Design a binder for these strands. Structure first.
Ligand SMILES: [Au+]
Ligand SMILES: [Cl-]
Ligand SMILES: [Cl-]
Ligand SMILES: [Cl-]
Lengths: 232, 226
DNA sequence: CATCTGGTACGACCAGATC
DNA sequence: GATCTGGTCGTACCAGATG
C-alpha cells in the first residue's frame, strides 16, 4: 500500500505488468486516471513523471501518455524492480546478470591493468581490512569490480556496474553467506592483485571465465534447497 | 529557456555539475528552492522526482533532499546529459563509448550465434532493405547490435545497449555521413551474416577489435578538421 | 509542542496536438 | 476554432523528523 504516491506508483506499475494497461497502448487521461486511482492529479503526475523516467511511460504534450515494452526503453535501473514482478522467473535473470558482470568484467579488468595498474592496486588492497560477514563482503566485492571499472580508465564501465549494484548485491548478501564462497572470491581478488605487478594481462579471461563457473557452481548449489513485457 | 520544468530542471542539474549545489551536500528546501528558481513547488516537485530517478538527488520524507556523487548513483542514462555539459572533453567520452560498444559486442554477438543463430540472421538481414543516407543508416547500425544482443539470449545486454541509444545514435548520425564509413559497416555486417551459416565462433573477437580500430580511424579522421 | 522539510489536495488556467 | 491531452500555478493543509 504505502502512501498515495507510492500506492499510485505500485499501482500503475502492476497495471502494466498485468496486461491491464497493456504495453503499446494509450493510458488514461491524467484526470480520469487520477480519480480512478484515488489520488489527486498532481500526486499522479509526480508518479507519472518518475515512472516515465524509469522506462515505462513516454509522455508528450498534446499526445496521450503511451505505455512501453520496457526492454525497449530502460536501463539496468529496472532489474531490481523486475525481479520483484516476475517472482517465478528470477533464477533465469540473476543467472544472466551474473554471466554479464563476468564476461564484461574480463574486458575492463584487463584494461584496468594496462592503464592505471597503480590504482588497480589501491582497490584490490581494500580486501585486507574488510569484515568477514556476508553483508560486509558483498559490499566489498561489488565495490571491487566497480572500483576497477573506473580504473580500466573508461568510466562507462562504471556507470554500468553502477546500474547493477542493486540486484547485484542482493545476490551477494545471499551467496556469500557461504564462507566457502568468501574464500574463492578472496583468493580470486588477491590472485589478481599480483598481476598488476606481474602485468600478465592474458591471465584474465582465463580466470574470470571460470571464476564465473566456479562461484556459479557454488550458487547453484545454494539454491538446490528451495504477465506483460517481452524483448526477444 | 523552455518550459518551467524543463528549465527548472536544466537548472538543478547544471547547478550540480558546477558546484553551486555541491555533491554530498544538502540542497535548498522546496519552498525556498522554488521561489529561488521561479517555478511553483508543484512544478519543482515534478522535476525533483524525475531527477531522483536518474540518480542525482535522494529525497526522503522529513530529512532534506541531499545531492549525490552521481558517479555512484547513476547509469548510462546520463551519458547524454553529461556530454552536453562537459562539452570540452567530449571526444575522450565518445571514444570511451565506442571503445565499449566494441569490447562488449564481441562477447554477446559471439553468444548470439551458438544460441538463436537462426535469428542472428533475420537481423543482419535487415541490412539489405535499409536505405543509404546516414540518418536511416545510424538507426540500422544501432538496431543490429541491439537486435543481436537480445538475440544473444541474454537480454540484459539489451538494457545496456538500450541505455546507450541516445548518444550512440548521435555518433551514427554524423559518422556514417561519409560513405567510406557505410561501406566498412556493411562489409562488416555481411562479413558476419555468413558466419551464422559457417558457425565459426572463435572467428569474432578478431573482426570486432579490428572494426573497432578501423571505423575508429575513419571517425578520428573526421574530427581533426573543424 | 514549535518548527524545520517533504507530501497531498483542489481548482482555475496555460499550451501542444488534432481534425 | 472545438476539444482532446499534458503542463503550470497557488494556496491551504497533512505528515515525518527533530529538537
Ligand atoms: Au602494480
Ligand atoms: Cl515529462
Ligand atoms: Cl529477497
Ligand atoms: Cl547556461
Amino acid at each position: 500500500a504505502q502512501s498515495p504516491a507510492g500506492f499510485a506508483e505500485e499501482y500503475i506499475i502492476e497495471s502494466i505488468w498485468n496486461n491491464r494497461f497493456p504495453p503499446g497502448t494509450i493510458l488514461p487521461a491524467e484526470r480520469e486516471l487520477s480519480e480512478l486511482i484515488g489520488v489527486t492529479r498532481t500526486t499522479l503526475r509526480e508518479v507519472l513523471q518518475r515512472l516515465a523516467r524509469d522506462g515505462w511511460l513516454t509522455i508528450q504534450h498534446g499526445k496521450p501518455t503511451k505505455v512501453n515494452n520496457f526492454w525497449e526503453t530502460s536501463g539496468l535501473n529496472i532489474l531490481e524492480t523486475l525481479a520483484r514482478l516476475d517472482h517465478e522467473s528470477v533464477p533465469q535473470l540473476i543467472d544472466n546478470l551474473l554471466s554479464v558482470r563476468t564476461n564484461i568484467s574480463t574486458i575492463f579488468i584487463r584494461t584496468a591493468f594496462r592503464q592505471h595498474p597503480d590504482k588497480a592496486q589501491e582497490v584490490l588492497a581494500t580486501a585486507n581490512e574488510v569484515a568477514d560477514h556476508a553483508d560486509a563482503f558483498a559490499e566489498l566485492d561489488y565495490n571491487i569490480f566497480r572500483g576497477l571499472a573506473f580504473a580500466s580508465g573508461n568510466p562507462i564501465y562504471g556507470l554500468i556496474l553502477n546500474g547493477m549494484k542493486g540486484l547485484y548485491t542482493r545476490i551477494g548478501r545471499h551467496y556469500f553467506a557461504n564462507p566457502e564462497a568468501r574464500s574463492l572470491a578472496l583468493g580470486f581478488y588477491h590472485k589478481l592483485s599480483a598481476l598488476c605487478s606481474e602485468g600478465a594481462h592474458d591471465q584474465v579471461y582465463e580466470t574470470v571465465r571460470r571464476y564465473g563457473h566456479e562461484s556459479g557452481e557454488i550458487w547453484h548449489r545454494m539454491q538446490k534447497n528451495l504477465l506483460a513485457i517481452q524483448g526477444r
